[PDB]
């Protein structure tokens, strides 16, 4: 079906509520915090639409189709252009279903859970923001534009870990839970720049082709293409919880329970596995990494 | 349970008129409009109240099912064509099989609900772990975390009668909408959004009196 040129509204669907609460939460703090439970409805509904706009986007893929992608140039300056946009391939629809379902469910569970609390509205804003950022990450065309969302979900997880911001442990766990995936995104960015220099492009349609087949012989870059990919793998490790970087999940579980259930099935697994699964076309030329991944696993 | 007796608390549907005495205004959505006095006796009153609530809810569902797919056809990706002609649409099975299955399941459900109406509380689904006391009923509002898991029909989000007023008013409006859609398709041969846009373009002439 042609229901793609309108699919870009998926990662931007809940946003028209977030900015319409934070403003109220900053300018008029004593009014929005009096429409307490009502604010749950305009969110759990909006995100809901996304879900029913995703199954019809995924059922198509089940019936057999071809993946699309849309690129737009968001910089035209002297010597080099930058692109953005998304793509809808099987894995995208898989993770889309898996994020929107658990999201729309944990929203209601949070309405039940955090009903005696005080930061009701702020909590809902954080949840919706993390959700609209994750929905963005999973549908993203070129590497730079997935890095743009990686660190966003990292910051969302940070703000959610130290949520109550007053328990003197939840104030010492958020810092670690940020610095670890900060090291991770450091490795991610270094690997991105490495592959950029090596191949000259950023998007998958060109990276998968160039990096696999055409590349010079041992001008030392071979050691670089062995090294640089290890950095992307390190990032995908650190966003998940593997051996060298796992010290942030056990203590990060200090946050509220619904968040503890959304950062252990929605982002902990997605931002970790999904990236490796999408970049698999690269790693088949590097048996060393194929073995090191299995070993760390 | 809050009462809305005569006075400023009673905005009469017909200004300058005393509403019928047996129309107190307890039922949300009341304005003292029963010139035919069908609600004269209380048993008929409650029966008609139940009928009104059921009609309103079913009409809301029906008008949603009409509206949303047609607009998602007009501009959205998938093109759901004329809903009035979707009644004869061709599926995996024949319409009579669908009819008999619908009738079986809906008979089961609506019969349980019928017995609940005739005998309140005697047919209810509300588990009871020890020491946690369950809620009662107000038939037409079953309660418990089966049909109120958001805990909206009890207190906190809004005084009850106000929310029930919202429901009954929107339901009357949706009944009007459904009968309007059907009557239009009797007269015209398009959907609701098509008539809507045709009226937008030419408000002065593109109307019922256009022919």
């Amino acid at each position: 079906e042609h229901t793609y040129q309108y699919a870009w509204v998926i990662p931007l669907l809940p946003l028209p509520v977030i900015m319409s609460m934070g403003f109220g939460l900053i300018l008029i703090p004593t009014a929005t915090k009096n429409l307490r439970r009502i604010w749950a409805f305009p969110s759990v509904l909006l995100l809901s639409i996304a879900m029913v706009f995703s199954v019809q986007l995924s059922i198509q893929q089940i019936n057999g189709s071809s993946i699309y992608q849309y690129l737009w140039s968001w910089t035209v300056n002297n010597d080099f252009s930058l692109e953005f946009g998304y793509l809808i391939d099987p894995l995208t629809s898989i993770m889309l279903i898996l994020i929107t379902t658990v999201g729309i469910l944990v929203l209601i569970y949070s309405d039940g859970y955090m009903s005696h609390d005080e930061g009701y509205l702020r909590f809902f804003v954080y949840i919706s923001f993390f959700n609209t950022s994750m929905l963005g990450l999973v549908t993203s065309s070129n590497l730079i534009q997935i890095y743009f969302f990686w660190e966003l979900v990292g910051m969302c997880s940070y703000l959610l870990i130290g949520f109550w911001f007053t328990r003197p442990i939840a104030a010492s766990a958020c810092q670690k839970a940020f610095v670890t995936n900060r090291v991770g995104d450091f490795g991610l960015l270094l690997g991105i720049l490495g592959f950029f220099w090596i191949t000259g492009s950023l998007e998958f349609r060109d990276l998968f082709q160039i990096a696999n087949n055409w590349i010079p012989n041992n001008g030392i870059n071979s050691l670089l293409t062995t090294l640089c990919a290890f950095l992307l793998f390190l990032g995908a490790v650190a966003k998940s919880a593997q051996f060298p970087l796992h010290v942030w999940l056990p203590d990060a579980m200090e946050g509220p329970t619904p968040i503890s259930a959304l950062i252990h099935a929605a982002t902990m697994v997605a931002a970790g596995i999904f990236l490796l699964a999408r970049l698999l076309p690269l790693f088949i030329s590097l048996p060393l990494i194929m073995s090191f991944i299995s070993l760390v696993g | 349970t809050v009462c809305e007796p005569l006075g400023p608390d009673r905005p009469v549907w017909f200004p300058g008129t005393a509403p019928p005495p047996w129309l107190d205004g307890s039922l949300p959505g009341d304005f003292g409009f029963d010139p035919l006095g069908f609600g004269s006796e209380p048993e008929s009153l409650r029966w008609f109240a139940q009928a009104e609530l059921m009609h309103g809810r079913w009409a809301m569902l029906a008008v949603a099912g009409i509206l949303i797919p047609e607009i998602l056809q007009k501009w959205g990706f998938m093109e759901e064509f004329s809903w009035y002609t979707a009644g004869e649409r061709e599926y995996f099975a024949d319409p009579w099989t669908l009819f008999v299955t619908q009738m079986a399941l809906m008979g089961w459900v609506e019969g349980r609900r019928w017995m609940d109406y005739l005998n309140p509380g005697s047919v209810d689904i509300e588990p009871r772990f020890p020491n946690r006391k369950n809620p009662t009923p107000d038939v037409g509002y079953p309660g418990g975390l089966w049909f109120d898991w958001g805990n909206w029909g009890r207190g906190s989000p809004e005084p009850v009668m106000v929310l029930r007023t919202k429901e009954i008013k929107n339901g009357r409006l949706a009944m009007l909408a459904f009968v309007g859609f059907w009557f239009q398709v009797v007269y015209t041969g398009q959907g609701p959004l098509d008539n809507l846009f045709a009226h937008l373009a030419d408000p002065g002439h593109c109307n019922i009196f256009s022919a």
């Binding site: 209601i108 569970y109 039940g112 | 020491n131 946690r132 898991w149 805990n151």
Partner: peptide, 11 residues
């Protein structure tokens, strides 16, 4: 002397 009764109707 109390008891762990059920939670709310929303969780």
């Amino acid at each position: 002397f109390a008891y762990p009764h059920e939670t709310g109707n929303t969780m």
